[PDB]
């Protein structure tokens, strides 16, 4: 599998699907979110991408901690 920094936009869509965060795929793709963006996303970016529910941002924050060992 690819290092995260090399994830294309669809690779991020696949990852979101895998997290049962599929309803965010279109926003992440329409906003040009690739693997290089994931380490840099702030809460305000996740809000701008339509991730308005606390639980769903916490799911993304949790997943990224394990992906990027932060
Ligand atoms: Cl949400
Ligand atoms: Zn959501």
Numbering used by the authors: 1780 to 1849
Reported in the publication:
Postsynaptic scaffold proteins such as Shank, PSD-95, Homer and SAPAP/GKAP family members establish the postsynaptic density of glutamatergic synapses through a dense network of molecular interactions. In the presence of Zn2+, the SAM-domain polymerizes into helical fibers, which may be stacked side-by-side through interhelical contacts. This enables the formation of large sheets where Shank proteins multimerize, allowing Shank proteins to serve as building blocks in deeper layers of the PSD.
Upon solving the structure of the WT, we observed high similarity between the Shank2-SAM domain, and the structure of M56E mutant Shank3-SAM domain. Though no Zn2+ was added to Shank2 crystals, we observed that about 30% of the Zn2+ sites were occupied. Apparently some Zn2+ binding had been maintained during purification. Due to the incomplete occupancy, the tetrahedral coordination of the Zn2+ ion made by His1803, His1835, a chloride ion and Glu1802 was somewhat distorted and incomplete. Nevertheless, the WT SAM domain crystallized in the same space group, showing the same crystal packing as reported for Shank3. Importantly, this packing arrangement allowed for the formation of helical polymers of SAM domains, and the side-by-side alignment of these helices, leading to larger sheets of polymerized SAM domains. As reported by, contacts via the intrahelical interface can be distinguished from the additional inter-polymer interface. Both interfaces are supported by the Zn2+ binding site which is localized at the contact site between these two interfaces. A closer inspection of the interactions of SAM domains within the crystals showed that the WT domain established several interactions with the neighboring molecules, which are responsible for the formation of helical fibers. In addition, we observed interactions to SAM domains in the neighboring helix.
